[PDB]
């Protein structure tokens, strides 16, 4: 009962830091595109 | 009741899934972008 | 030498999730170091791995950075970040150099 309800926040944190720990990858290969992007200077 | 078992397995997995995540994290954030910007 | 680096933090002694230590060589884009986990998982960056330590202790709440066997490349500004109900909190930062 109550130590059910402090289940659906630890579910409701682990989903919501899933979202934005996710979120700093689309940034991240976004800039990982855009150094490999400098190897046309190399090849 | 019976319900309860299945959170933890919403806590273990969900759980599990941020390890691989940060792993990744330790290639791409890191390490390729530090490693290839020098090359 | 080695350096311990901890994050003194407000509240959730045990609840916050990923907590994450960031450092920026002057002149270079701020980048990952280390992370910790709720439960206890850690990683490296590779350019640290088996060197840099990320360490909890629930009971002080605060985030331990052992950083051993520094090298001169590890002179840059290091601050700790974290996530808590999404929201990205960072810090003030410190700088460690060393020669």
């Known amino acids: 009962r109550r130590d059910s309800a402090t289940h659906e926040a630890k579910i409701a944190e682990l989903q919501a830091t899933i979202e934005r720990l996710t979120s700093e990858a689309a940034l991240a290969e976004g800039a990982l595109e855009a150094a490999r992007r400098d190897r046309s200077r190399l090849q | 009741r019976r319900d309860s078992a299945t959170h933890e397995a919403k806590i273990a997995e969900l759980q599990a899934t941020i390890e691989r995540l940060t792993s990744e994290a330790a290639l791409a954030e890191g390490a390729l972008e530090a490693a290839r910007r020098d090359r | 030498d080695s350096l311990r680096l901890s994050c003194a933090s407000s509240?959730?002694?045990?609840?916050?999730?990923?907590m994450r230590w960031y450092r920026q060589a002057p002149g270079k884009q701020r980048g990952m170091v280390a992370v910790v986990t709720g439960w206890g998982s850690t990683n490296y960056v590779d350019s640290v791995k088996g060197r840099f330590i990320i360490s909890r202790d629930s009971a002080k709440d605060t985030v331990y950075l052992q950083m051993n066997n520094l090298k001169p490349e590890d002179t840059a500004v290091y601050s700790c970040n974290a996530i808590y109900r999404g929201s990205e909190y960072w810090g003030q930062g410190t700088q460690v150099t060393v020669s």
């Open positions: 509240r959730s002694i045990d609840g916050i999730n990923i």
